[PDB]
Amino acid sequence: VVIDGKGHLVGRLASVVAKQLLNGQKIVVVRAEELNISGEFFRNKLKYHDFLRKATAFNKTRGPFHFRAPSRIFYKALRGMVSHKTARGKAALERLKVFEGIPPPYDKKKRVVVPQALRVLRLKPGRKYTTLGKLSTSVGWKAAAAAAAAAAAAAAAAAAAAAAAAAAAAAAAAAAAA
Amino acid sequence: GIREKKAEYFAKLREYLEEYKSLFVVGVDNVSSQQMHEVRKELRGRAVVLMGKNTMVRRAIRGFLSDLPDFEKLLPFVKGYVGFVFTNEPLTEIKNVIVSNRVAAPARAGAVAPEDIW
Amino acid sequence: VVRIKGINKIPPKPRKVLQLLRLTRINSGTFVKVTKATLELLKLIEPYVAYGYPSYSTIRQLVYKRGFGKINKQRVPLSDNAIIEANLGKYGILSIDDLIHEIITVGPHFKQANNFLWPFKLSNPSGGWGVPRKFKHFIQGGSFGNREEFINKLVKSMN
Amino acid sequence: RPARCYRYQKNKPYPKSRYNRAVPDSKIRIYDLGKKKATVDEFPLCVHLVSNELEQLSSEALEAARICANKYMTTVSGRDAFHLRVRVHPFHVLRINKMLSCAGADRLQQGMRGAWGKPHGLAARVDIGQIIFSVRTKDSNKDVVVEGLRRARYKFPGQQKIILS
Amino acid sequence: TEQQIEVPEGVTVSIKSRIVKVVGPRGTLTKNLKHIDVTFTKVNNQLIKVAVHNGGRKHVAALRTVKSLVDNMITGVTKGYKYKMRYVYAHFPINVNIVEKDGAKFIEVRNFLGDKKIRNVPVRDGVTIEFSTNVKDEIVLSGNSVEDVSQNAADLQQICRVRNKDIRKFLDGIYVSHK
RNA sequence: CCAGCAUCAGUUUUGGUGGCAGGAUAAACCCAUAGGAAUGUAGCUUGCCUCGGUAAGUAUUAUAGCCUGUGGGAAUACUGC
RNA sequence: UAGAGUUAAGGUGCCGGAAUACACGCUCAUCAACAAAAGGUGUUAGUUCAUCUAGACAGCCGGACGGUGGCCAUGGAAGUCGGAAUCCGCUAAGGAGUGUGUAACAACUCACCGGCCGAAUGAACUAGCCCUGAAAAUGGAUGGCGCCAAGCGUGUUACCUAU
RNA sequence: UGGCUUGUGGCAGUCAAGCGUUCAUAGCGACAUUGCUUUUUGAUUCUUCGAUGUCGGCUCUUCCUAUCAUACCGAAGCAGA
């Protein structure tokens, strides 16, 4: 089942995705960088899972491999839920691939239709909190056009809907004018 | 700031002012040391030339009522650094010695037995 | 009286007073005496065996499905006729309502003399134990002590 | 052994004049201080530094608190309006083990066998309710020992509860 | 609570989400203004009104300040503030060029302490920095804003703070005179 | 041949839903009438200061607390159907 | 020795089955995840009392008086060293003094107190959430994903639960 | 030998009266203690006899900073220095 990882928290999306992947259902998450992890920029700085001290230079020869990009976070994160250990686990992992950007131009389950939780309201809650598409910058994340442009790609998808789309709309409108 | 002080304060000024007749508000419009006591020594007997917080004596002149009226029209005289002079040493003798010293920074005016003088 | 705590973990101070109950595993419960004797029993083994004040209907369903003998497997199930009359006969208690108004009132007989077992095997309470179990006795909200009103539907599950 | 390690007591009592093959010397200089005279005479006010705990206040720290407060209370006067006491004594002789060592030693010195804590120190017991530093001090104006009970409980193990007596 | 702020004849206030504008003859200034809950988008003709339901210590802070800065923005765009500093020097003649001709959105301080070098900082928005009459010690800022105006006090002070030699003895330093 | 599991028709045991009732009791989802204590809102009038409001009267516009007297309501812990 | 009937000890955001539930609440720091002496304008509640239209309190603004250098430690002591008397003055305020300053004079500021203003402010006492005190070497290293409620108390409800 | 405690003790916070020209903390610190800690220096047979071979140095294969020196900052009872 195709969802969209856009404008809410990261963990309270990851959890919901795991129970859906469980059997073998082919859930792909689209966008990782427009999620939101919490923490400061002080404690959540030095020991953080991009490049600063820990999880980039975090390897041996026969040993780990992490990331320094806001795209690769959600991919690594959902081995860290559904492990490679069990047979269904490694099978369920392959049912998920995460994408940067929004390559589908169409509107699937995205903003209005999504599961519960997700879109937390910060009022009395929340002074400090990060964003994955801020945190990964001076970590080796460049090349914004390449990844950031993806937004530009998602735009052309919208465009395809808005067409023909625009046509059936103009019609639908004339229908009610009547 | 205790009200047992302040209650007998405004009450005492009433008793002194019922005993006397005339009033005259003093104009303390910037002084200099020795010129304060040079006012005081020309009076001496029973006058009223100390100081004392204005909000308390504002209540005294308002809550006067010896006959029927209080000290009417007195408030446009008394605002800012200001004073009074009354009680029983003779009337004109008290009145002119304020404006003996205070000709440099002069004094104001006030109702004398209350006929309004300005 | 009932039984709450298990067979294991009993020092020789509880072990003496558990003896003439003749009671093996959990839930199973005998019909004890009441005079002065009941105090010292439910002083020592108060946090082992709990009690309460049941009604007439509470110990009515109990001697029906859990209707034992000592010797011989039961042919006719435990009605009024299955006690006194029927084919052979037991002692000479009439109905189950005469059997409840025997024991709860004064108790002129014990259940071995009526030709049943010494304890009766019961059930676990439907509706559960939970928080009123081990944690404390009656005044807080516990299984132990005198459960007056609460022992009604409790034992109309353990029947 | 700091006084962190002179806190509690599995050291059980042992304190008589008959049955003792001689105690060591103590630090303790003086008991009542400031006033000798006035206990409750000049002083209807007191603070007791009442123990929460059942500790041994060792004779090391016992002199320490008392001598800090001795030197302090000279500025106000060397006989000012306080009455800082010492109460409960080192009656008990504090038994402390070592020189010890099992094998590979001079004569062998054991530890386990040779369980006798060979008498080294001295300690008082200052159990629940009890105090050493009772400070009968004056009614109006100069009360000085509320301050001087920070300086009392510092040179004392444990968390004593300050009670007005 | 809620408060009221008016607007005079030749000024136009217009808040539009958190984005505020105050209009005057010097310039038109933008900042943002919106905390938790508090809606300052309530334009009742002349009266722009801040209003919130809740209270609390840190919460009451953003009730007053959003009221204050619209009164301070009207004084800025109409009259213009004057924030006050002075160039001080010990021996060596501290030399300054201003944001005119040479300075294309920058000011400069050269011969600070004993510089053969130069310590340079840009300037902020549309601040008309009035350095000197003929010659003066005082530099005095003025502009269309409130914030951006005295930000050219910050610019100028920090870039040549007396760091590498002591402030105590060596009196080359552009210190603040008063707010 | 024991356990899982078996056509097709009728019935027990145990618990609940839903409808209804007895023990025993009357608060209520919300129930009358008379006299006395109380004091809220709308509207009007009058007084005083000020451009914004406030005080007093208002049983004589409309409505109430809490007690006393009289009269009338009243499905349920437990237990069974 | 086996399938049902009922539930303990204990769990339900997710790896991995079950509430992204319900009601009320301090707090949102990722608190949750050790630590004392000793300490704090985060932030909330209760009780008692100084204080209040008899003008609370703050800021801003003044009077800094005559006797007079009161007296006396002392080489000198000066309000301004130590110690006692404890006022007069002008009776709407200035004490025989809140703080600074020079050996000290020389110099300066003010509670006490004055003048604008006009409503609830402040000491204690008790309780809770926070907050300060706390350093070590292989790759997260006080959870994998991470959570600001998917934390926790109090009150309640539903689902899961030993031959 | 490894484990455990920190005995024997190291370090810091620090009670802060003293004493340095006046002057609790420029500095010096009576009297000592609380937390941390594992370095002076060892208490203990917990875990080990079909191996538990030593010291100073050469050579080459890590990580941390209880910090000597290099970047950046502030203060003194320090005249620039």
XYZ file of N, CA and C (backbone and C1' of nucleotides) in Angstrom, chain A residues 10-12 15 19 36-38 43 47 49 54 80-81 88 116-117 120 122 124-128, chain G residues 13-18 20-21 27-31 138-141 144-150:
240
model
N 8.670 11.107 12.223
C 9.333 10.026 11.525
C 8.990 8.701 12.165
N 9.097 8.583 13.510
C 8.891 7.343 14.234
C 7.461 6.907 14.224
N 6.522 7.873 14.346
C 5.095 7.616 14.357
C 4.546 7.442 12.952
N 6.536 3.081 12.612
C 5.767 2.117 13.373
C 4.567 1.624 12.597
N 3.665 -2.702 10.777
C 2.506 -3.585 10.868
C 1.853 -3.833 9.514
N 10.246 14.550 10.504
C 10.642 15.423 11.578
C 11.034 14.520 12.710
N 12.329 14.531 13.102
C 12.798 13.907 14.322
C 12.923 15.053 15.303
N 12.922 14.775 16.623
C 12.944 15.803 17.646
C 14.372 16.001 18.114
N 22.744 18.537 22.195
C 22.843 17.142 22.585
C 22.651 16.281 21.357
N 26.665 13.182 18.963
C 26.218 11.834 18.762
C 24.872 11.902 18.069
N 23.069 10.258 14.132
C 23.205 9.169 13.194
C 23.611 9.571 11.785
N 29.394 10.040 15.518
C 29.051 8.626 15.433
C 28.835 8.099 14.021
N 16.212 -1.612 11.038
C 16.283 -1.465 12.478
C 14.977 -1.660 13.193
N 13.855 -1.714 12.443
C 12.622 -2.273 12.936
C 12.634 -3.708 12.494
N 10.659 -14.152 7.020
C 9.652 -13.158 6.724
C 10.185 -11.762 6.919
N -3.809 7.215 11.727
C -3.880 8.021 12.926
C -2.494 8.478 13.337
N -2.390 9.136 14.519
C -1.184 9.738 15.051
C -0.623 10.782 14.114
N 1.280 15.758 14.890
C 1.282 16.303 16.227
C 1.227 17.816 16.167
N 2.066 21.330 18.063
C 2.973 21.897 19.034
C 2.490 23.294 19.377
N 1.533 24.285 23.662
C 2.118 23.974 24.967
C 3.242 22.981 24.750
N 3.080 21.930 23.947
C 4.206 21.159 23.459
C 5.167 21.917 22.562
N 6.487 21.723 22.783
C 7.523 21.854 21.784
C 8.090 23.227 21.609
N 9.313 23.448 22.151
C 10.147 24.571 21.777
C 11.147 24.032 20.780
N 12.035 23.117 21.245
C 13.122 22.561 20.474
C 12.667 21.306 19.766
P -0.104 0.458 22.306
O 0.253 0.730 20.783
C -0.153 1.956 20.143
C 1.044 2.658 19.482
C 1.796 1.859 18.415
O 1.106 1.974 17.160
C 3.336 2.929 19.902
P 1.572 1.232 15.840
O 2.747 0.292 16.316
C 3.310 -0.702 15.451
C 4.850 -0.811 15.552
C 5.420 -2.223 15.655
O 5.350 -2.846 14.367
C 6.577 -0.801 17.132
P 5.529 -4.414 14.227
O 7.052 -4.670 14.566
C 8.037 -4.533 13.534
C 9.406 -5.002 14.027
C 9.491 -6.450 14.507
O 9.655 -7.328 13.389
C 10.594 -5.014 16.043
P 8.595 -8.404 12.934
O 7.756 -8.718 14.243
C 6.904 -9.876 14.226
C 5.993 -9.932 15.462
C 5.239 -8.627 15.778
O 3.885 -8.898 16.176
C 6.601 -9.212 17.620
P 2.781 -8.947 15.046
O 1.470 -9.068 15.913
C 0.422 -9.967 15.527
C -0.472 -10.276 16.731
C -1.046 -9.066 17.470
O -2.200 -8.593 16.764
C -0.166 -10.601 19.033
P -2.389 -7.066 16.410
O -3.045 -6.501 17.736
C -4.390 -6.916 18.057
C -4.669 -6.744 19.554
C -4.492 -5.335 20.126
O -5.680 -4.565 19.892
C -3.434 -6.927 21.537
P -6.920 2.100 18.682
O -6.052 3.427 18.692
C -4.629 3.318 18.567
C -4.007 4.647 18.976
C -4.440 5.878 18.151
O -5.012 6.899 18.987
C -2.087 5.780 18.321
P -6.467 7.476 18.717
O -7.421 6.725 19.740
C -6.901 6.247 20.991
C -8.026 5.632 21.833
C -8.813 6.565 22.749
O -9.809 7.280 21.999
C -8.353 4.464 23.830
P 1.765 23.656 34.187
O 3.158 23.193 33.600
C 4.400 23.340 34.302
C 5.314 22.132 34.032
C 5.547 21.752 32.560
O 6.530 22.624 31.989
C 4.993 19.814 33.768
P 6.782 22.650 30.428
O 7.170 21.168 30.044
C 8.526 20.715 29.913
C 8.817 20.089 28.531
C 8.400 20.971 27.356
O 9.238 20.757 26.207
C 7.033 19.040 27.360
P 10.422 21.730 25.851
O 11.662 20.960 26.450
C 12.521 21.615 27.395
C 13.326 20.584 28.191
C 13.727 19.268 27.510
O 14.792 19.531 26.596
C 12.971 18.849 29.709
P 15.460 18.491 25.610
O 15.064 17.065 26.141
C 13.909 16.397 25.636
C 13.657 15.176 26.508
C 14.804 14.167 26.466
O 14.900 13.443 27.704
C 12.916 13.275 25.346
P 15.941 13.991 28.774
O 15.161 13.761 30.119
C 15.191 14.740 31.170
C 13.907 14.658 32.000
C 13.559 13.287 32.587
O 14.343 13.028 33.759
C 11.644 14.177 31.616
P 38.072 2.062 23.645
O 37.226 1.794 22.335
C 37.677 2.157 21.019
C 37.455 1.034 19.969
C 36.017 0.968 19.412
O 35.987 0.381 18.098
C 36.400 -0.945 20.689
P 35.571 1.214 16.826
O 34.076 1.629 17.144
C 33.682 3.009 17.054
C 32.158 3.181 16.882
C 31.334 2.920 18.155
O 30.142 3.715 18.148
C 30.767 1.308 16.570
P 29.882 4.936 19.108
O 28.762 4.397 20.093
C 27.592 3.728 19.599
C 26.484 4.750 19.318
C 25.506 4.856 20.481
O 24.834 6.115 20.464
C 24.529 3.618 18.712
P 25.292 7.330 21.346
O 25.139 6.815 22.821
C 26.275 6.365 23.573
C 25.810 5.291 24.551
C 26.868 4.922 25.612
O 26.304 4.709 26.917
C 26.270 2.998 24.427
P 19.283 2.758 20.295
O 19.300 1.296 19.698
C 19.900 0.973 18.435
C 18.847 0.548 17.399
C 17.950 1.664 16.854
O 18.666 2.407 15.861
C 16.642 -0.245 17.354
P 18.340 3.915 15.520
O 16.802 3.913 15.147
C 16.410 3.527 13.822
C 14.883 3.495 13.718
C 14.139 4.793 14.047
O 14.160 5.689 12.923
C 13.085 2.996 15.129
P 14.882 7.094 13.010
O 14.418 7.644 14.429
C 13.080 8.162 14.552
C 12.311 7.731 15.818
C 11.816 8.854 16.714
O 10.823 9.605 16.011
C 12.371 6.943 17.994
P 10.370 11.038 16.484
O 9.493 10.765 17.763
C 8.185 10.202 17.615
C 7.558 9.972 18.992
C 7.515 11.191 19.906
O 6.465 12.066 19.475
C 8.187 9.309 21.140
P 6.594 13.625 19.692
O 6.851 13.792 21.245
C 5.824 13.466 22.202
C 5.420 14.661 23.084
C 4.848 15.862 22.318
O 3.835 16.548 23.071
C 6.730 16.558 23.501
P 2.299 16.382 22.748
O 2.022 14.875 23.084
C 1.884 13.869 22.080
C 1.839 12.464 22.708
C 0.639 12.240 23.651
O 0.161 10.891 23.615
C 2.642 12.137 24.901
P -0.681 10.335 22.400
O 0.030 8.945 22.132
C -0.025 7.883 23.100
C 1.351 7.229 23.335
C 2.450 8.133 23.936
O 2.867 7.636 25.209
C 3.347 6.746 22.271
